[PDB]
Protein backbone atom coordinates (compact mmCIF):
# COMPACT_ATOMS: atom_id res chain seq x y z
CA UNK A 1 0.00 0.00 0.00
CA UNK A 2 0.91 3.67 -0.31
CA UNK A 3 -0.91 5.58 2.44
CA UNK A 4 -2.16 3.70 5.49
CA UNK A 5 -2.67 4.34 9.20
CA UNK A 6 -2.23 2.95 12.71
CA UNK A 7 -5.00 2.14 15.17
CA UNK A 8 -8.23 3.08 13.40
CA UNK A 9 -11.86 2.36 14.25
CA UNK A 10 -13.82 0.69 11.45
CA UNK A 11 -16.87 -0.71 13.24
CA UNK A 12 -18.20 -1.42 16.73
CA UNK A 13 -20.19 -4.34 18.13
CA UNK A 14 -21.04 -3.32 21.69
CA UNK A 15 -23.24 -0.33 22.51
CA UNK A 16 -22.43 2.82 24.48
CA UNK A 17 -25.02 1.62 27.00
CA UNK A 18 -23.05 -1.60 27.46
CA UNK A 19 -19.63 0.04 27.28
CA UNK A 20 -20.42 2.52 30.05
CA UNK A 21 -21.10 -0.41 32.38
CA UNK A 22 -18.15 -2.39 31.02
CA UNK A 23 -15.82 0.55 31.65
CA UNK A 24 -17.07 1.14 35.19
CA UNK A 25 -16.32 -2.48 36.07
CA UNK A 26 -12.89 -2.31 34.43
CA UNK A 27 -11.78 0.88 36.19
CA UNK A 28 -12.16 -1.10 39.41
CA UNK A 29 -11.02 -4.58 38.37
CA UNK A 30 -9.26 -5.57 35.15
CA UNK A 31 -10.25 -9.19 35.82
CA UNK A 32 -13.91 -9.45 36.91
CA UNK A 33 -14.37 -12.92 38.40
CA UNK A 34 -17.43 -15.03 37.57
CA UNK A 35 -19.34 -13.14 40.26
CA UNK A 36 -18.61 -9.96 38.32
CA UNK A 37 -19.00 -11.11 34.71
CA UNK A 38 -22.26 -12.84 35.64
CA UNK A 39 -23.81 -9.91 37.52
CA UNK A 40 -22.75 -7.56 34.72
CA UNK A 41 -24.00 -9.97 32.06
CA UNK A 42 -27.51 -8.94 33.12
CA UNK A 43 -26.49 -5.34 33.78
CA UNK A 44 -25.69 -4.80 30.10
CA UNK A 45 -27.51 -7.82 28.69
CA UNK A 46 -24.31 -9.48 27.46
CA UNK A 47 -23.02 -13.08 27.48
CA UNK A 48 -20.45 -13.92 30.15
CA UNK A 49 -18.31 -14.79 27.13
CA UNK A 50 -18.50 -11.32 25.57
CA UNK A 51 -17.39 -9.53 28.74
CA UNK A 52 -14.26 -11.68 28.83
CA UNK A 53 -13.31 -10.43 25.37
CA UNK A 54 -14.16 -6.75 25.86
CA UNK A 55 -12.00 -6.86 28.99
CA UNK A 56 -9.24 -8.74 27.18
CA UNK A 57 -8.78 -6.18 24.41
CA UNK A 58 -8.97 -3.44 27.05
CA UNK A 59 -5.91 -4.76 28.90
CA UNK A 60 -3.98 -4.20 25.67
CA UNK A 61 -5.30 -0.64 25.48
CA UNK A 62 -4.45 0.02 29.12
CA UNK A 63 -1.01 -1.60 29.23
CA UNK A 64 -0.04 0.26 26.06
CA UNK A 65 -1.38 3.61 27.28
CA UNK A 66 -0.27 3.46 30.92
CA UNK A 67 3.25 3.35 29.46
CA UNK A 68 2.80 6.45 27.31
CA UNK A 69 2.24 8.24 30.62
CA UNK A 70 5.35 6.79 32.25
CA UNK A 71 7.53 7.78 29.29
CA UNK A 72 6.14 11.31 29.61
CA UNK A 73 6.39 11.58 33.40
CA UNK A 74 8.91 14.24 34.45
CA UNK A 75 10.84 13.64 37.67
CA UNK A 76 11.97 17.25 37.89
CA UNK A 77 9.39 19.88 38.90
CA UNK A 78 8.31 21.37 35.56
CA UNK A 79 7.58 24.88 36.84
CA UNK A 80 7.45 28.15 34.94
Amino acid sequence: GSSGSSGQRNRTSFTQEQIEALEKEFERTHYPDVFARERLAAKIDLPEARIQVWFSNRRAKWRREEKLRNQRRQSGPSSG
Side-chain angles (χ1 to χ4, degrees):
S2 293
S3 61
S5 205
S6 67
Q8 281 286 83
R9 179 88 281 156
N10 282 351
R11 68 273 298 181
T12 188
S13 303
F14 304 86
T15 70
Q16 194 271 298
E17 272 280 78
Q18 300 178 323
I19 301 179
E20 53 179 58
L22 282 151
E23 271 210 278
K24 206 202 161 162
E25 175 64 18
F26 184 113
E27 72 151 73
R28 200 174 72 195
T29 178
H30 297 191
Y31 309 116
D33 306 305
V34 66
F35 272 126
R37 278 207 278 292
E38 282 202 39
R39 272 188 156 281
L40 207 89
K43 181 154 163 60
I44 43 185
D45 270 283
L46 276 167
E48 209 193 304
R50 270 271 167 282
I51 296 154
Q52 328 208 90
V53 188
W54 187 97
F55 272 66
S56 181
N57 271 288
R58 282 278 163 294
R59 304 157 186 162
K61 161 182 275 86
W62 184 78
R63 296 162 89 169
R64 88 178 158 159
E65 272 207 76
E66 209 307 315
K67 192 84 202 187
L68 308 187
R69 197 169 204 170
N70 170 12
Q71 76 168 351
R72 181 210 90 201
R73 177 160 73 181
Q74 195 72 36
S75 301
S78 280
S79 174

